[PDB]
Ligand binder design. Sequence first.
Ligand SMILES: CC(/C=C/C=C(C)/C=C/[C@@]12O[C@]1(C)C[C@@H](O)CC2(C)C)=C\C=C\C=C(C)\C=C\C=C(C)\C=C\[C@@]12O[C@]1(C)C[C@@H](O)CC2(C)C
Ligand SMILES: CC1=C[C@H](O)CC(C)(C)[C@H]1/C=C/C(C)=C/C=C/C(C)=C/C=C/C=C(C)/C=C/C=C(C)/C=C/C1=C(C)C[C@H](O)CC1(C)C
Ligand SMILES: CC1=C[C@H](O)CC(C)(C)[C@H]1/C=C/C(C)=C/C=C/C(C)=C/C=C/C=C(C)/C=C/C=C(C)/C=C/C1=C(C)C[C@H](O)CC1(C)C
Ligand SMILES: CC1=C[C@H](O)CC(C)(C)[C@H]1/C=C/C(C)=C/C=C/C(C)=C/C=C/C=C(C)/C=C/C=C(C)/C=C/C1=C(C)C[C@H](O)CC1(C)C
Lengths: 163, 90, 228, 219, 81, 26, 221
Amino acid sequence: EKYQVIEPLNGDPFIGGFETPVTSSPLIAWYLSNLPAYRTAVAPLLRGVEIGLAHGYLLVGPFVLAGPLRNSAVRGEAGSLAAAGLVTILTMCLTIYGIASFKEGEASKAPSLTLTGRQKEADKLQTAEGWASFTGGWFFGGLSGVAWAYFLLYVINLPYPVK
Amino acid sequence: FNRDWLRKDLSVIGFGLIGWLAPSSLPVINGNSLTGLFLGSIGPELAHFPTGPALTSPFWLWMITWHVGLFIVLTLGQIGFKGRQDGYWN
Amino acid sequence: RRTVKSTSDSIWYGADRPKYLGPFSGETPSYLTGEFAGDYGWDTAGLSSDPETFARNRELEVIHARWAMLGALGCLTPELLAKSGVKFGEAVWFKAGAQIFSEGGLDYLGNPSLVHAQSILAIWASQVVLMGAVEGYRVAGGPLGEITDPIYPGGSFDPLGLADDPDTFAELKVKEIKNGRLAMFSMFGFFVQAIVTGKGPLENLNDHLADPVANNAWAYATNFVPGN
Amino acid sequence: SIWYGADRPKYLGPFSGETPSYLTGEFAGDYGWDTAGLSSDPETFARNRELEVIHARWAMLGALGCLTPELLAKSGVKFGEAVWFKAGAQIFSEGGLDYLGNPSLVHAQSILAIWASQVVLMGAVEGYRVAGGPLGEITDPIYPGGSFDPLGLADDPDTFAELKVKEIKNGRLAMFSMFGFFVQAIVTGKGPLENLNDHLADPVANNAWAYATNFVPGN
Amino acid sequence: YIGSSTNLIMVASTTLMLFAGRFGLAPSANRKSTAGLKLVDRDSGLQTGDPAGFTATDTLACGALGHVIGVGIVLGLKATA
Amino acid sequence: KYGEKSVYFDLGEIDNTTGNWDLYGN
Amino acid sequence: MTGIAEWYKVYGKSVAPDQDARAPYYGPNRPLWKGPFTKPKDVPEYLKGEYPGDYGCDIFKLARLPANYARLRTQELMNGRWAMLGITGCLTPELINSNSTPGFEPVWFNTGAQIFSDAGIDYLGINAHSLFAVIVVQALLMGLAEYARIKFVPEGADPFYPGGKTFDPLGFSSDPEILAELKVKEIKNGRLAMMAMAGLFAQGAVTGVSPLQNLHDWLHL
Ligand SMILES: CC(/C=C/C=C(C)/C=C/[C@@]12O[C@]1(C)C[C@@H](O)CC2(C)C)=C\C=C\C=C(C)\C=C\C=C(C)\C=C\[C@@]12O[C@]1(C)C[C@@H](O)CC2(C)C
Ligand SMILES: CC1=C[C@H](O)CC(C)(C)[C@H]1/C=C/C(C)=C/C=C/C(C)=C/C=C/C=C(C)/C=C/C=C(C)/C=C/C1=C(C)C[C@H](O)CC1(C)C
Ligand SMILES: CC1=C[C@H](O)CC(C)(C)[C@H]1/C=C/C(C)=C/C=C/C(C)=C/C=C/C=C(C)/C=C/C=C(C)/C=C/C1=C(C)C[C@H](O)CC1(C)C
Ligand SMILES: CC1=C[C@H](O)CC(C)(C)[C@H]1/C=C/C(C)=C/C=C/C(C)=C/C=C/C=C(C)/C=C/C=C(C)/C=C/C1=C(C)C[C@H](O)CC1(C)C
């Protein structure tokens, strides 16, 4: 009869999940709901652009500060090219994943029901053309993010503690 | 999930702040002639130089002690306030 | 995630609102039901039992709070600018009213090209006329519109329209009352510690920061003893 | 009884004719003295009664404690400052607060520690008084009873009411005397019993009228 | 040694603990403490000549705890002063 | 109905029955 | 039934109703002044045990007259109560501070000449040497209390156990049984105070030193 913070998934005890503060806190749930992957109404291309931008931007750093040429004068260029190559490989990964997973002309099988039960429209990211647009946007955004990180770090040479 | 899992009683943090300032800010007659909070304030005073860690200076021990005390005080205050509404001890 | 409808709708109102003694607030006055902003249930003296008196006191409190916020800001900024480097007759608020009796008169940020007033009599007369006009307008009404709520006229006094929604309007009421009460408390500070220390607020703060344990109000505890 | 009821002794004695309606005689220390009309509302009257009783008890404690050091000093007990209105500055002395000139006793030096301890403890007890605490719950804001009635003197209603009246009368006397303490400290600059000795020595010369010509506003 | 500060401290601690246990100010054999630190009455089954219900086991427990506390106070006051 | 009582099986609402929900799909 | 009157953790003889708080100290089966060696030859036929502290010791046959017995009981009670205060007043001064360095005196029997000569009475370390300014006040105050006690019995209160609201404010005597044993406790503690006083008088007369210092010398050495 106590408070009992922990609850079953949407009140259903026979679904394989739980309601924890980590899962569905108002702050955590708000944060996850507004991530580009979970903005179902937005076109897949723009979500892919945002995801690729973020991922290339964060990927530039490790290659630059850990690559084999980190002690040379081409450290920045080598790291940026390594990040771009990883982005390209992941673009091939996304393309083949979409080819294998989705077939042209089929409806989306993503969950179209909210926790409350609003029964919204199915997400178009889980479609052949949706995933193709997502992959193209991710490629463009990844290259853009790598270029932006290289420009900020080296072409413009903003003052940063570690680089 | 009721969206108030951490039942918000904002007086808890202030009560814990008072109840941790009171014992920590005490002129102990022991080897520490002064109080530990003054040491934990001196540490930052000597460590305000930008872009540099303490580097194993006498600042980490006081930081850890003070903040462990603060965290345990806050946790015990939360538990004490929210156990009265329940019947954990009544 | 879920879509939320029932929220913490104006925790500052109702019977479950925070109280002035916190957990030790049991004997809440019956007339203080949390209807109005800033209602912490603090009327130990019972000076607002009569609803008409309670409304009068609310009006007085809001006007005092607004004037106190204005006064605190006007006492604080001049010293901040003086420390920045701006030069004028005097930095402390309680000696800035006598600058008009200096050789250069009253200089606004020490700029003769600005107001550069000379006679205190003219300033006083102009203030009397203008403030009487506006005070009468507030009591009854005037160019900016007749009075609907004497405390919160709104309308022409709400150009930016931050008080559109009633809920955010109540939240802003609470915020305004709290910030104003803090301002009044700090102004009473200013007064008492200017009487005692004889120094400006920010320089008192600086000297406290220099040595907090030794330089505090207790250093002035013996300055008003009657037997010496 | 004599004090409770329509026919009660009034503050003006035989000269009292305008008895306020709200002052009927159902509360202790009801002499019918309300000429400012500051207790007309029942709730305001209850709040004023609570304030009066708390002030009375604090004034009793203050009056006893302001003159106890004086009597002990007259006997010969050594203090730092026996006088009440300089008894608080000895915390700043190098020897600290001796509490009857005994270094083995409290022997406090830091006024900050005294202030913090007082704040915490007084906040706790004040809050208990408002809302209840270890020493019973709150039923009557000013007459709790129980843990604060260990000797059980307030068992039957009659003695309890007579003791109410006696309490409020001694308390009003103490409040008057403490206002006197404050004013005499402000003007004379000497302790209360020292003023008493001066008055007893030369009552005609050493009195309040001797200080009438000290606040003349020459400018 | 009778008038020594150590003797006074130990005697005071033991007497105070015995007084608290005997007069229902501390847990005893017949005075159980709940989770709320409220003292309830229980039948320990030990008969004692004390009208209040102070048993020999209660006396031993109170004396032992009083000695523990008195030793702590004595050594602390010696180390500090 | 899925939420009318303690019943958690409903052929008319199979997505609710099987747990085919979108937790963060704004 | 009143203030610290239900406070039944001080009885002295009763864990439970097994005894009624008055079965011993009264009646035929009570402790006597020679323990089990009181074969009846000195236990008179008027000391049956109705009154507190009755141990059957009337060697000299003083209380053989019932009227005199009541007078003696009252006289015993009064020196008994006064002895209790006196021994407390003779010892507490010398448990708080000591040494007669100032015009103060820690010795009970040397505090009376303190005013008479040199300085006056200085409470704990009210002056000069005026005897007949304490004497008159004490004589006046006692004469009226003394006079108000022998008379002014409200309607039917025992002149030595009034038990009203000014002499029994704490209401220990609400329960008759707890009044029966408290009377025994009073008289027995009073008798102890009286023996202690005779010890102080005799020891002061012989040794001439403060009673506690006599104890310190006896025990330590
Ligand atoms: C009451 C008080 C503090 C109260 C603190 C409270 C309620 C804290 C509450 C909270 O934490 C909780 C519970 C929960 C949180 O969610 C909310 C907050 C709000 C954060 C301090 C008083 C603090 C009071 C102080 C410091 C008083 C100082 C007085 C001085 C210095 C007087 C000086 C003089 O009078 C002399 C001595 C003699 C003359 O000669 C000279 C002058 C100058 C006139
Ligand atoms: C609630 C309650 C309850 C119970 O029942 C009872 C009781 C207790 C009574 C109550 C309480 C109350 C209180 C606390 C109050 C407070 C107040 C204040 C503080 C005010 C201020 C207030 C304040 C204010 C007005 C302010 C104002 C200001 C001003 C004008 C200013 C001016 C100026 C300045 C700028 C400066 C410059 O250089 C100049 C000049 C020109 C000078
Ligand atoms: C009735 C009526 C009626 C109508 O209607 C109107 C009128 C007329 C107005 C009214 C009247 C009124 C009045 C008269 C009032 C008064 C009051 C007072 C006096 C108070 C006090 C009050 C008082 C009080 C509180 C007191 C308190 C005290 C205290 C705290 C103390 C403290 C202290 C001491 C001990 C000393 C030391 O060293 C320190 C200190 C710390 C300092
Ligand atoms: C029973 C019997 C029985 C059979 O039949 C036979 C025989 C055996 C013979 C018998 C016995 C008897 C006896 C033993 C008796 C005793 C008595 C007494 C002891 C009293 C006291 C009695 C006692 C008493 C009163 C007491 C009192 C006291 C007093 C006043 C005090 C005073 C004082 C004091 C405080 C101290 C100061 O500083 C001063 C003075 C002023 C000095």
